[PDB]
Design a binder for this molecule. Structure first.
Ligand SMILES: C[C@H](CS)C(=O)N1CCC[C@H]1C(=O)O
Ligand SMILES: [Mg+2]
Ligand SMILES: [Zn+2]
Ligand SMILES: [Zn+2]
Length: 231
């Protein structure tokens, strides 16, 4: 059921309903001779929508907004970027031009600025220390500690038991640790443990790339990170 990278041409975006009021959005890009998918989240926030992450680039994010308009028809009023990479903030300017209030932690904003990436407008306080959690409407934002990046946030939708791990959590078919250029390999397993400890009731786990699964994705991620660490 879940759209794979072979089913979405670069430039198009698919929506996938995970639970009532919760969708992932799936987009693709070519990189270094392969095509990769990328997921974000959409969470119904009363009569508005909360967007988690861009669709990885301006063109995809424009397509995302058009697809949300077509398929859901509620306004995207806020967006949270869960780390500073282009699959999370690339397209912030498109969101901003569309009247979406864009948010990220100060750690993400600082790192995005260093990288020369797009910078969400608003700063999310209360997430600077590993284990910090803040409510953001229909989701909880959780900073589990450094993992895939030092700023990576995870997002939990308590009404749907959906845990969005972002790029700190790998899909089952991923055997490498992904892009580790900005990762904290030493802390990544401990950060995963914090996610497991805070959301042991999670029923759906959404990685930043690839197929959703369950909490098994967390142990899988730990195994993959350990294997990469021991290369
Ligand atoms: C843009 C994302 C951010 S997690 C990324 O690093 N990717 C996605 C494609 C592969 C890998 C890379 O560029 O090395
Ligand atoms: Mg595994
Ligand atoms: Zn990343
Ligand atoms: Zn990513």
């Amino acid at each position: 059921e879940y759209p794979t990278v072979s089913e979405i041409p670069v430039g198009e975006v698919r929506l996938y309903q995970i639970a009532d009021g919760v969708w992932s959005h799936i987009a693709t890009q070519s990189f270094d001779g392969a095509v990769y998918p990328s997921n974000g989240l959409i969470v119904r926030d009363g009569d508005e929508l909360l967007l988690i992450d861009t669709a990885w680039g301006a063109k995809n994010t424009a397509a995302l907004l058009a697809e949300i308009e077509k398929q859901i028809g509620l306004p995207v009023t806020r967006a949270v970027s869960t780390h500073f990479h282009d699959d999370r903030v690339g397209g912030v300017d498109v969101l901003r031009a569309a009247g979406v209030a864009t948010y990220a932690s100060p750690s993400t904003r600082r790192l995005a600025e260093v990288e020369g990436n797009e910078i969400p407008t608003h700063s999310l306080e209360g997430l600077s220390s590993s284990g910090d959690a803040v409510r953001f409407g229909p989701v909880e934002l959780f900073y589990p500690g450094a993992a895939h990046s030092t700023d990576n946030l995870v997002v939990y939708v308590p009404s749907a038991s959906v845990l969005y791990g972002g790029c700190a959590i790998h899909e089952l078919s991923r055997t490498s640790a992904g892009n580790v250029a900005d990762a904290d390999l030493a802390e990544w397993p401990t950060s995963i443990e914090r996610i497991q400890q805070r959301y042991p009731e999670a029923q759906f786990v959404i990685p930043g790339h690839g197929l959703p699964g369950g909490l098994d994705l967390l142990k899988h991620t730990t195994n993959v990170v350990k294997a990469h660490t021991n290369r």
